[PDB]
Structures are given as structure tokens and as C-alpha cells.
């Protein structure tokens, strides 16, 4: 539809980015959009602006939802949004920056500790409660969508695929997610909620410790069946954990939903307790940076 190009566009405020943004710098780009760092001309406030063209952009109604969602749901660890520019054909969204960069690197080529692991997950908890209390769930929890504070702080990014629900509708059946992290009755298209989260959260887990979610030296798809088949996943090596850690495991990867934690009961697990400052994450974010110096 036009019309839905039109809906878009109507949301979105009509001005130059170069008005209150100088300093554009190039830091990538998605099969979405180009992705710029930037500076507020007044304040100093260094930003992430993604450069994106309407007129290619297949599915217009998903890009409405992820900037509504954004809007209305502003919080401590979610990346938050600042602003969104429409400049005749391209559309221009501006975030924070967050310059510790993505936990994907962290947990790729760093060994965390049981503080730091625990650190994460509480602040990923918080911002999954937050969200699950207003009837947004993410579905693509991972450490790539994790962003990192220069100070630690820990940020939940990417809503391009997260799903609002009411009484009316209070769960999902459709297939969305990554296939690695997806939870099994996502896999199987039995009726979810909110706790799909608390599963992806879990296999993010398993990224912190092993350094890579079960599965993937497969393909996506059979990945998907060895979910759909295995339930609950296994740890490579379990006797390296704390009895507390293996019990937060199990916790977030319980196959019967009604046992599996929920953000708010999982916030006060006792794995938590054992978390370091959120600075401890600092050297480990300084090392994913040498590391991946090359590419
Ligand atoms: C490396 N520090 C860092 N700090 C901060 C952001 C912030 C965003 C961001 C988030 C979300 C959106 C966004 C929000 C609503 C609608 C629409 C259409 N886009 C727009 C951007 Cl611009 C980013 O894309 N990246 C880069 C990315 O690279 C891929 C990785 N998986 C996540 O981070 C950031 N990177």
C-alpha cells in the first residue's frame, strides 16, 4: 500500500537532521538501513542515527510499529529513542549511542564470570519486566540486540520484531524470532506470551557461558528441530557452574511455561545476588575491542 506508506510518513516529524546533528560518522550498515554516531550541536550528547529509504523497504508496518513502540515505552535499559526525521524519500531515526558496543562481541571472544553474567542478566530482567507489565514482548532477545554503556550500563535494543498483546489477544503462534534462541513452544506454534523472553534470556545465558547459543555449528532450520525435539538444552560442561547458576538456568529454560520464571520472580533468584558493579564489564568490553581489531 501507498496507504501505509502514507500512515508512516504521518508519524514521523518533517526536518533536517543537519539542524540539530553535525557530525555524521559511519559505522555500518543492515539489511535495514545505514547506521551513523553523531553529536547534538548544543548539549554534546554523542547519538546513533540509522539512514533509511521508505521506498525500498518491504513490511512499512513493522518500521511503524518498532517507532511507536519505542516512543511509549522508554526505559533505563532499553536503548531509548531520541528522535525520528522524514527528509522527502528517507526516513532518519535517532537513538542513543551506546559506545561499549554489542555483548555479542563480549561473549564471542571474553570468558565472563558468574558476577558478570549475573550483572547482565539482572538488567536484562528489568527491562523484560518493565516491558512484559506493558504488554510488549520482545521475541528477538540475544546478545546482539544487547548494547553496552562505556560504563557498563547494559541496554536492550532492536524492537523490529516484538509483539504488543492485550486481553483481547494475550498470545501468539507465529514463528518470529532467531532460530537459535527461539522457545520451544515458539518453535512448534503452540499459543506463547510474555515468559518466550525468559527462554531467549536464557540461551543468552548459554552465549555467556560457552560463547555461542546450543546449536550453532547447524543450520537454522535444523536447528529448529532440535529444538522442537530436545526441550531443554545442554550445557557442554554443567559441572562448571554454581548449583545457584544451574538452578537460574533451568529456571528461564523450563519447557513447562507455568514453571519457567517470569522477568519479576526471576529478579529476585538468588544467582542475581552474586553480581559485580556494572564497571566490571569495562575491562571485558576493553578486550572484545582489541579482539576484534582485524574484523
Ligand atoms: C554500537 N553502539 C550502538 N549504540 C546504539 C545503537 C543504536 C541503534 C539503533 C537501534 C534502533 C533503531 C530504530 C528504532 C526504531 C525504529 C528504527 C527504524 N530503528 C535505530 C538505531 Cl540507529 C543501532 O542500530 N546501533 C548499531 C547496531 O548494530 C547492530 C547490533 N546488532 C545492534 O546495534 C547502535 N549501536
Given at each position: 500500500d501507498e496507504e501505509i506508506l502514507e500512515k508512516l510518513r504521518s508519524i514521523v516529524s518533517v526536518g533536517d537532521p543537519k539542524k540539530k546533528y553535525t557530525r555524521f560518522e559511519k559505522i555500518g550498515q543492515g539489511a535495514s538501513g545505514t547506521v551513523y554516531t553523531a553529536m547534538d550541536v548544543a548539549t554534546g550528547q554523542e547519538v546513533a542515527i540509522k539512514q533509511m529509504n521508505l521506498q525500498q523497504q518491504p513490511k512499512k508496518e513493522l518500521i511503524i510499529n518498532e517507532i511507536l513502540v519505542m516512543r511509549e515505552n522508554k526505559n533505563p535499559n532499553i536503548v531509548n529513542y531520541l528522535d525520528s526525521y522524514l527528509v522527502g524519500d528517507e526516513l532518519w531515526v535517532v537513538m542513543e549511542y551506546?559506545?561499549?558496543?554489542?555483548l555479542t562481541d563480549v561473549v564471542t571472544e571474553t570468558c565472563m564470570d558468574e558476577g558478570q553474567i549475573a550483572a547482565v542478566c539482572r538488567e536484562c530482567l528489568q527491562a523484560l519486566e518493565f516491558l512484559h507489565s506493558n504488554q510488549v514482548i520482545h521475541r528477538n532477545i540475544k546478545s546482539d540486540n544487547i548494547l553496552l554503556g562505556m560504563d557498563g550500563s547494559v541496554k536492550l535494543t532492536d524492537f523490529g520484531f516484538c509483539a504488543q498483546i492485550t486481553p483481547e489477544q494475550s498470545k501468539r503462534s507465529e514463528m518470529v524470532g532467531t532460530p537459535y534462541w527461539m522457545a520451544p513452544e515458539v518453535v512448534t506454534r503452540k499459543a506463547y506470551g510474555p515468559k518466550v523472553d525468559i527462554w531467549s534470556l536464557g540461551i543468552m545465558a548459554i552465549e555467556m557461558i560457552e560463547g555461542e547459543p546450543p546449536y550453532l555449528n547447524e543450520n537454522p532450520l535444523r536447528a529448529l528441530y532440535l529444538i522442537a525435539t530436545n526441550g531443554t538444552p545442554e550445557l557442554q560442561n554443567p559441572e562448571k557452574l554454581s548449583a545457584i547458576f544451574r538452578d537460574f538456568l533451568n529456571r528461564c529454560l523450563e519447557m513447562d511455561v507455568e514453571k519457567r520464571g517470569s522477568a519479576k520472580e526471576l529478579l529476585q533468584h538468588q544467582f542475581l545476588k552474586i553480581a559485580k558493579p556494572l564497571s566490571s564489564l569495562t575491562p571485558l568490553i576493553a578486550a572484545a575491542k582489541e579482539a576484534t581489531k582485524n574484523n
Open positions: 551506546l559506545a561499549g558496543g554489542s
